[PDB]
């Protein structure tokens, strides 16, 4: 029975793999693309040929969409799994790490690095990078729908992608690295990026239309030795993109005033920790300075990726930043990978140069592992923590929303909280109490003047023992 399995079953199951995991979902996605392109074409035909003479899903815009603004203890939030429409669920031997979720005007993005076996030392199997459409299923509930899916030819050399929607296309910027993760092997990183355009409405024979992976022959760095994009989503300002990033500054060039290190209320902290925790290790050659990547499309055929650094007010180490256009003005999440374990997100006062009015929050923090746990403000040398973003869902009352891991050190219990800057209003426990989790990416939008939110929560499944990104469409309720 070696011959039957080797010939009549083996290659046929390989063909069914290739078909029903590559070419059937790509054709259903391209089918939905033709649905939407057709509907846009006939609506343009009606707006031309019926405009007589005489002889959906969109992001948070400035409409007063009323939500619950009063603190309750009742379970008023109802989380909904919508992860089933994606290639989230692999087999039991693959761990799904390094995710992305990036929504703007209804057209998302989604990437993940599928590994083999363990989540850390596994071999990178593939890297889906795929844009799509945020929809509504038959119950007034959003759900994702991938139209265009691309994979790079060398999955070991694509790190830290950032993904911004731009005018019915989708521009995803990553980091080419043959020497490992450029945060880690930073002195030997080649200093090279690559941008891959995708189309959120692909076509039948759109070869150079769908995936035209651009070159980047000019990066405006400045003082910084290397620049890498770092964080899930960004904004567009017309033709100008803003990928979240980090800039590898040589430590001997980094100039910092140690009197600014807030050792006032804390006694176990020198004023020499705030400089040394700017790198991942206090004798590292480079220093992570988060920021943005101004990518204006109006520069011609070969544009320039310009690194904008961040303002030094409430400055810590380079985190996955996430600038997002919410209610008109960009809001800048920037995670807590350092001593400042409170949430560090705020409205953007000006984009170039990047000066972020950081919200003075004291109820939302992230679980750090060893030295810098949840609710630590003492300046200590650590590069610890996880990514737990927050989307601004109300600016009039300064309410935001995201999934946060309610435990001090063990990164567990992901809780969808909706919080003011000094009090958590209400919250939803997405899973069990000891459900170990990681990076959560929350994006919100309007489905028929209702604020829904998609929180990609990497939940460790206790059943088959690997990490899967589970989405959670959670409606922000109006009645309390």
């Amino acid at each position, epitope marked *: 029975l070696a011959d039957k399995i080797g010939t009549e079953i083996g290659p046929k199951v390989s063909l069914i793999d290739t078909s029903s995991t590559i070419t059937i979902p790509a054709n259903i996605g391209l089918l939905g693309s033709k649905i939407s392109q057709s509907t846009a074409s006939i609506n343009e035909n009606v707006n031309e040929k019926c405009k007589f003479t005489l002889p959906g899903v969109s992001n948070l815009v400035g409409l007063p969409n009323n939500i619950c603004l009063q603190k309750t203890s009742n379970q008023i939030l109802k989380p909904k799994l919508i992860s089933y429409t994606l290639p989230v669920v692999g087999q039991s031997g693959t761990c799904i*790490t*390094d995710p992305l979720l990036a929504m703007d005007e209804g057209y998302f993005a989604y990437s993940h*690095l599928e590994r083999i*076996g*363990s*989540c*850390s*030392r596994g071999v990178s199997k593939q890297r889906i990078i795929g844009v799509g459409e945020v929809l509504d299923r038959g119950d007034e509930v959003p759900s994702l729908f991938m139209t265009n899916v691309w994979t790079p030819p060398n999955p070991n050399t694509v790190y*830290h992608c950032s993904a911004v929607y731009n005018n019915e296309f989708y521009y995803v910027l990553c980091a080419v690295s043959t020497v490992g*993760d*450029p*945060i*880690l092997n930073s002195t030997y990183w080649s200093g090279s990026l690559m941008m891959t355009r995708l189309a959120v409405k692909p076509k039948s024979n759109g070869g150079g239309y769908n995936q035209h992976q651009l070159a980047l022959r000019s990066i405006e760095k400045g003082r910084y030795d290397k620049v890498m994009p*770092y964080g899930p989503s960004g904004i567009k300002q017309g033709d100008t993109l803003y990928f979240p990033a980090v800039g590898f500054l040589v430590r001997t060039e980094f100039k910092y005033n140690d009197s600014n290190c807030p050792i006032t209320k804390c006694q*176990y*902290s*020198k004023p*020499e*920790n705030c400089r*040394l925790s700017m790198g*991942i*290790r*206090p*004798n590292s050659h480079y220093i992570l300075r988060s920021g943005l990547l101004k990518y204006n499309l109006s520069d011609g055929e070969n544009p320039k990726v310009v690194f904008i650094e961040i303002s030094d007010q409430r400055l810590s180490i380079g985190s*996955p930043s996430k600038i997002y256009d919410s209610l008109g003005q960009p809001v800048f999440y920037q995670a807590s*990978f350092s001593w400042d374990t409170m949430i560090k997100f705020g409205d953007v006062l000006t984009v170039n140069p990047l000066v972020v009015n950081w919200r003075n929050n004291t109820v939302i923090s992230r679980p750090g*592992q*060893s*030295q810098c746990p949840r609710f630590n403000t003492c300046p*200590e*040398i650590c*590069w*610890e*923590g*996880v*990514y737990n973003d927050a989307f601004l869902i109300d600016r009039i009352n300064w309410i935001s929303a995201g999934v946060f891991l309610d435990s001090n*050190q*063990t*990164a*567990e219990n992901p809780v969808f909280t909706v919080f003011k800057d000094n009090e958590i209003l209400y919250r939803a426990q997405l899973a069990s109490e*000891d459900t*170990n989790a*990681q*990076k959560t990416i929350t994006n919100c939008f309007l489905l028929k003047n209702k604020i829904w939110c998609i929180s990609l929560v990497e939940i*460790y499944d*206790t059943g088959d*023992n690997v*990490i899967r990104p589970k989405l959670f469409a959670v409606k922000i309720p109006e009645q309390c």
Partner: antibody, heavy 129, light 108 residues
């Protein structure tokens, strides 16, 4: 290769200050993000005490030994100490010094895998009057 | 804290046996685990890090698998240079807690 070596009294009377020293040969403590201490009670299992950064002076300590353990430093003589205060007979153990190691996978995930690679040869310290 | 309970506390097997040593945790660590072979009168030695990696210098008869709350330290072909104390270590959070240890003896 970095080679550790403990040193200190095996004779410490109870309710006193243990004064150990793990001087480091083959490497500087200006390297090596963390340096730890581990004791092992004979007849019982290993249990970890607390680390020191080498380049910094920030510590962590085991909360079962939080109010007692002091880990001091000496950058010049390449040594780092241990000060267990108010010693009891149940603190009879083998106090290993250990070079700490971190495995960062995917540096948008700063939770490393932690283990100890280079251990000292150990020293038997019995609290006895 | 995280308690690391091993089973059994002292296992006995002849040369060439398949030895499976466990280390069950109280809170679920993801795979942040290391295995230590402490020879008598010697320092401990790292065997299997991240619960699935064979370290450089540890022979192929040592293998490890398992994640979450149940862990397996598998010794395929047991050898006379392997009868020592085996300990687990969790690295998921701090204080780093070792197991109580596993004593391995020769069944003769």
């Amino acid at each position: 290769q970095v080679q550790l070596q403990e040193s200190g009294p095996g004779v410490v009377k109870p309710s006193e200050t243990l004064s150990l020293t793990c001087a480091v040969s083959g490497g500087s403590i200006s390297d090596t993000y963390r340096w730890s201490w581990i004791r092992q009670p004979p007849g019982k299992g290993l249990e970890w005490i607390g680390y020191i950064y080498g380049s910094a002076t920030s510590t962590y300590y085991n909360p079962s030994l939080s109010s007692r353990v002091t880990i001091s430093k000496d950058m010049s003589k390449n040594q780092f100490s241990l000060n267990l205060n108010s010693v009891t007979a149940a603190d009879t153990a083998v106090y290993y010094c250990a070079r700490d190691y971190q495995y960062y996978y995917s540096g948008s995930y700063p939770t490393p895998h932690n283990w100890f690679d280079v251990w000292g040869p150990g020293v038997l310290v019995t609290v006895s009057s | 804290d995280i308690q690391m309970t091993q089973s059994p506390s002292s296992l006995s097997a002849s040369v060439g046996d398949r030895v499976t040593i466990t280390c069950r945790a109280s809170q679920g660590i993801i795979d942040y685990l290391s295995w230590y072979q402490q020879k008598p009168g010697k320092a401990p030695k790292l065997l299997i890090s991240t619960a699935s990696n064979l370290e450089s210098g540890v022979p192929s008869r040592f293998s490890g698998s398992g994640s979450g709350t149940e862990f397996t330290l598998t010794i395929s072909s047991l050898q006379p240079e392997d009868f020592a104390t085996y300990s687990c270590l969790q690295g998921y959070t701090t204080p780093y807690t070792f197991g109580q240890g596993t004593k391995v003896e020769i069944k003769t």
